[PDB]
Amino acid sequence: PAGFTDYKVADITLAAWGRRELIIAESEMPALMGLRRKYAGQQPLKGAKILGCIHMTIQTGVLIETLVALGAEVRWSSCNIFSTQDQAAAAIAAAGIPVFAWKGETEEEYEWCIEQTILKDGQPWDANMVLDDGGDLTEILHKKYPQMLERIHGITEETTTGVHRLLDMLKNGTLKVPAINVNDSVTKSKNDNKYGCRHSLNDAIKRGTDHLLSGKQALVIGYGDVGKGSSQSLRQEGMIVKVAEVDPICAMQACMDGFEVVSPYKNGINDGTEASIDAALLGKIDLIVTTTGNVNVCDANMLKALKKRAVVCNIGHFDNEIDTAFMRKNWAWEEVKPQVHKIHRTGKDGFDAHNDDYLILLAEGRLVNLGNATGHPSRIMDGSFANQVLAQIHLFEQKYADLPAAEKAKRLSVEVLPKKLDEEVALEMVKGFGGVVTQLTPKQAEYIGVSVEGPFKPDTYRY
Template identity: 80%
Template sequence: MSTVTATNNVTSLHDYKVADISLADFGRREITLAEAEMPALMSLRKKYAAEKPLAHAKILGCIHMTVQTAVLIETLVELGAEVRWSSCNIFSTQDHAAACIAAAGIAVYAWKGQTEEEGEWCIEQTILKDGTPWDANMILDDGGDLTAMVHDKYPEMLASIHGITEETTTGVHRLLEMMEEGSLKVPAINVNDAVTKSKNDNKYGCRHSLNDGIKRGTDMLLSGKQALVVGYGDVGKGSAQSLRQEGMIVRISEIDPICAMQACMDGYEVVSPYTGGINTGNITDIDMRLLQDTDILVTCTGNAN
């Protein structure tokens, strides 16, 4: 149970902390709608609910706390697992989804608009139960923050953890760095490079959602404006298509020559964000004229180069 005092109207009660528990009914309606769009998980529930193949699984989760993730969480629980959850992003939580999961008796620490410190606190609360490290045996991560915190602050837990799944490119890169330096202590599965993730969600999910998110957040007409997309991997490809179908003038910055060639062949102008096309590592080498002509800048890579 959390003993931290609630602030800013965020509810802290029992083993959860969410923005507003009264949103649970709305969350349930939205989750029911999401179930209709997730037939694979629903088929798994129907097929294996009686067998409980995840009995004795104790799962720490740190993935965007949305209605879609709620369907995943409830599937894990229905198949026998115990789950503790937080969001991997301080802005992505859908408060009604988090409230519904909390009302269902599942430990969740997430609300939209956290500070960085609150985000780290929420991740730590999934690790701790009644103030002590939980005897978890699996980690489901997105971005690597939960994995890093367990390794850095609670290494004693690693002996009982069978493995880690990592959902996103940035988290996979962190795992590879840990493996190279010898600090990764448990097996990890690279979910991001599954074809259904990298070639489906990364590309088509971004194509569907980017323009919608920008318009909801800014209420701005996009047609005719200048956009710079940094990175032309699967996420960049989908994002560029999303902006182009709004009528934006889209330019691409990409350091990988193959991806840059793909951007060119797809009809985009490929540009360098650096004066003369050379990155010396100095901020003074950034081509400020390019940024001055850009209305919307979209970063689609965790590569700082």
């Protein structure tokens, strides 16, 4: 880099390798590159200054350079201590883009990186847009830098957990800028959340352990979009997969999908006692994966009862799905290699190197697909990130922070993109596979009551 020092990455000399991978990923992301080509001339993001907080992967690189290509300045950090691809961060920094991100941050460094996006030369940057994944940056602004939100036109939030936090703020009257729920586009939720975890969960388990999965027993906690994709990731490898759920509709889907639905607790009752644990069930499990976005769904008593040498991991947004704190307090951790630890249940101080009573924890309980592999593939993230670019254009052009008070009150909300845009994203994805979408005849369009151009479904439609 030149006199440009406004970044922090593991190793800037990985930049050329990162550039090589970005050029490949561009060919895998036709929806995102289509927006680049469509809007480059109009510069719809000219004057936007975007605080971005999301896993600093190669896929995120293509997103960042699309926003910049459309006129935005950005300052970027990762939303997870383990999810950065260091060659991707290096390529972005070498392009002159402020990025503060490396694989293997401490918690203190994770907070520091987010603050380095917020501050430029020790004072708040004149941000006016936010892109977030999980709500951490959104939370830091509302709590520690509320003045900055006076100039911000909106937030575009990537993921289910982040959206939940936004909706709680909106209900409490504490959300200060409008948001777009990017997660609930169909080309995000039912693409990224499900098919992404199908690709990347068994990918990360293989890289982390190289264990044969076929013929072994898995327990997947949760059967939402991530749990659906995770269960398929394992079943298609030949695992015998059981599913836990609190939602009977999602449990019904798991049954019909061919899974046995079980609870870690006798009769499903989690009363906090060891006696409530179905030890017979847990003693047979070779792999447990948490997918819930909830708290403590693989708890201390479950970890005590798991089959020896079971693998434990989490593909939900936050690491508190597993009680890793209990394991930190009571058991000895033996690093196998980065983001793979054997947890010795024989005690706290030291271990027998040949002890047989351990669990294998991946990514210290952080998002396993990003921690132990590379997260979702470019062609899937293409859908999520075309939605992000559209969401950023829409909120920036709305200019919420400049509106009169009455107009602000009518626009202070958490919304999804219109279905027409969802379909236009999907169409580019289908063309990327070489699929050919049929066009309705006028009479056929009239018969089912839609425009030949779409949208083809009512907003109630679930796909």
